[PDB]
Amino acid sequence: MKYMITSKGDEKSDLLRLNMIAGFGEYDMEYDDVEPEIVISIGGDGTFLSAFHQYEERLDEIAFIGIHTGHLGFYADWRPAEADKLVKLLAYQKVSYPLLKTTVKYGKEATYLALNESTVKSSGGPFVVDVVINDIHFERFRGDGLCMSTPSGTTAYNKSLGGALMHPSIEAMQLTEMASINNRVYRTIGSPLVFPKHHVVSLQPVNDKDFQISVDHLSILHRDVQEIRYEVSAKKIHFARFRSFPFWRRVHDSFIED
Template identity: 30%
Template sequence: MSQRNNIYFFYTHKDHLDEKLQQLFELARENNFNIVDHPDQANIIVSVGGDGAFLQAVRTTGFRQDCLYTGITHSNESGLYCDFNLDNFDEMLDTIIHEELEVRRFPVINVLINGESAFHCLNEVSIRSTIIKTIVMDVYIDDMHFETFRGDGLIVATPTGSTGYNKSTQGAIVDPKLPCFQVSEIASLNNNRYRTLGSSFILNKDRTLTLQIVQDGNDYPIIGMDNEAYSIRNIKDLTVTLSDNVIKTVKLKNNSYWDRVKRTFL
């Protein structure tokens, strides 16, 4: 128990939420948990507010490998990253206390921009044009030139990220037990002159994806990483690989990834 009894709550302070969370804080203390003021002191990091808050909590706290993450949604909401809501927080504490928890491990991708700036993504990285003009990218798989893409942009998604932006572009939903990442097109241009694959494709964990931006005036695209946008001038290339790191989350029994997919979409 002493190994994992320090909890940090990640949430946006709002009067009505602060009031409700005070009840949860008291419940946690009654069960011998310590509520800490800084995530570096925590063994468990709890986000409050749905999948967006969970992604932000993971990114803000540095994709920590030495703690468990878990998410709490607001009442009557569901989340693909969040097993709990404000109405069953006591169930989460009971799970942790009695060591009945299962740990889920979600894949993470590494993104290297211009060979200099390195980032992690739990959901996806997307690169999109910011002007009314197609963006052109040479796509390399390992050292092989695969295609020259022309269109609005590309999405590179993790298995858990496959249910997000990737799904809206007709990408496949991927089991997070598969160590891989997926590449999906955003409004590709296909005609007698330009040709792309025209569908998503999935790369194994040992592959390296390189996207080289053709410098034709569209070298200031928007780079989206999970739920944050990065505007970086003079983008030349992105290199994406599957990270050795994973995000460990608390899992309720009888609530698999596919249970949550069914509950969310069907």
């Protein structure tokens, strides 16, 4: 079975990567980073996020595996001391988490796929957008920006914005506000919004048409923006599962105690 391994780049991650490859050499496993069937990420959630977008065009043939070189992450689910036990079993069950689709239309169009969330901010100055939910005008937002998050991404940026922690078995997307201006004239919903499948959220500019759009770790300035469209993607990221590590248990170890 084809596979590949990404490393955080430090001394501990590179050495653990070469030992797993040496262990895989004792089996019928071929290292191929062009079309692998198992992608192993060694580092942090950002290392896993980089490995996700590195193979986002081949998501239905790949089962991802995360190993945290430092503290426990949400996508990294294996301590470095449990690595030799992995390559053995890797020679299991597959669970799937929802993904967020982001479409940007200018005056072509660009689609994006996010594992954590997608964020829109102002290219300097004020940020004003008309929030449109299923072609119905819902509100005109004024503030710093908005954040549409995946279920697994609710524990990341979505959590710091007052959002709710959502179990990754629910196919949905959550929208949160960033310091919304609310007075007598300007009115936002304030509460986070959770959208089911096939529901389309559209952001439309009022005056400024340039926005600093971010998709997971990446963030690029988009000029002449006509519409930013959010919707739950039909693609799902597949994880390679070898035991029981519940999401709530994983939430407990990251924010409560471990």
